[PDB]
Amino acid sequence: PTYETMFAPEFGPENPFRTQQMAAPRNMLSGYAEPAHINDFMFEQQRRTFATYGYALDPSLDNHQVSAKYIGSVEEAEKNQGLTVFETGQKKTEKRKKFKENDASNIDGFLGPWAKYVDEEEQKELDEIT
């Protein structure tokens, strides 16, 4: 194998007779798909990171050949200085105090993990629709 053989570009005007979608490489009619063996833990960790705060690193191999940036919501990455969901943060802000009753002796008063929180004109239009 030689890097020069795969690195050698195709001589041509890119053939703009096709569109941008059909001239793109594929194997299925929708994108080039191939299986791999990525670790599960960091995968699910950055998945939960993007699910909570909306930033994660960008996985590929041959898009730009230099890529170490963050994607999604950009400013919240540098706002939190790149923390994860499994790490104890630098502060404990906007924390939400519940009440507990874990004696397991009283009747109709035991509220542990099944506890409700301390906090607990449209009908005319909905009648006119139905």
Binding site: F7, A36, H37, S60, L61, Q65, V66, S67, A68
Partner: protein, 299 residues
């Protein structure tokens, strides 16, 4: 020519060059070990199969007949480079094997280290551990001196430890890293050992019968570690003039072992680089990374 190789479906964690410079070996998260022609058209031939965990580290013995493979499945496999047949499974550790090294010269020896905090010496003929060194913190990188008397271990205590095979005692400790050590490698002379650590410091340590006693021989900079927590490995050039170490910032860093100037910073990779290797005769650099592609830089 640059030469771009592809094949690995998952992240590549390691690659090595055959001792005679005729072929390459590479492996990673997929669990497959690929062999490559160094010259010709850079063709790919045998695939070694049988590891259930990911391949953490490949090595060749000095003869280039035996290929060792440390896996996350707690087993270190011994492979025949000639046929591609498996020889032995070193079953032993209770947790992931992080790394392995094979003693050159002296009768065949193998060292392993894992997350169970132990370091084990294996004789390929016994199917059992010879010595066990309980540390207490996870062990990440291990190498033998050329006299086959000492074991050099890097863990997460920021302190490289040296073990005496006869006394079975903690002979030496090296201070000088602020964070976990991810990769150790001896010079071809046995003279110097190269270390990578999270603190982004590449440090050369000199191991000798007569030592200054404060063996921070040299320090180099530029190599960045980040949130990916990839093991980072570094290598000595065939003549000990160049030092290469991969980084997480997509650049291959090559330094001048004397002046400490950065000779090369190379791009081309999209992701973090996990290992850089030097061809034994010619100025060729094999760069392996998490973008699942390899390059053959020529200097």
């Amino acid at each position: 020519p640059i030469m771009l190789l592809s094949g690995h479906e998952g992240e590549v964690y390691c690659c090595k060059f055959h001792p005679n410079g005729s072929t390459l070996a590479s492996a990673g998260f997929d669990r497959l070990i690929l062999l490559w022609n160094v010259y010709g058209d850079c063709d790919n031939y045998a695939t070694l199969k049988g590891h259930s965990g990911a391949v953490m580290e490949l090595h060749y013995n000095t003869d280039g007949s035996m290929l060792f493979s440390a896996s996350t499945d707690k087993t270190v496999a011994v492979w025949d480079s000639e046929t591609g047949e498996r020889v032995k499974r070193l079953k032993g550790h209770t947790s992931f094997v992080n790394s392995c090294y094979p003693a050159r010269r002296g009768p065949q020896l193998v060292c392993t280290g894992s997350d169970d905090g132990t370091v084990k010496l294996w004789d390929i003929r016994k199917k059992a551990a010879i010595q066990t060194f309980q540390n207490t913190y996870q062990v990440l990188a291990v190498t033998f001196n050329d006299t086959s008397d000492q074991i050099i271990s890097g863990g997460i205590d920021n302190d490289i430890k040296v073990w005496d095979l006869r006394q079975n005692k903690l002979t030496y400790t090296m201070r000088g890293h602020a964070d976990s050590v991810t990769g150790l490698s001896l010079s071809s002379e046995g003279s110097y050992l190269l270390s990578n650590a999270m603190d982004n410091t590449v440090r050369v340590w000199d191991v000798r019968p007569f030592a200054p006693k404060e063996r921070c021989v040299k320090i180099f900079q530029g190599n960045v570690h980040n949130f990916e927590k990839n093991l980072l490995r570094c290598s000595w050039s065939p003549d000990g003039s160049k030092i290469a170490a991969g980084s997480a910032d997509r650049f291959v860093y090559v330094w001048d072992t004397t002046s400490r100037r950065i000779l090369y910073k190379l791009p081309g990779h999209a992701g973090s680089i996990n290992e850089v290797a030097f061809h034994p005769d010619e100025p060729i650099i094999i760069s392996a990374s998490s973008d699942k592609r390899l390059y053959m830089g020529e200097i």
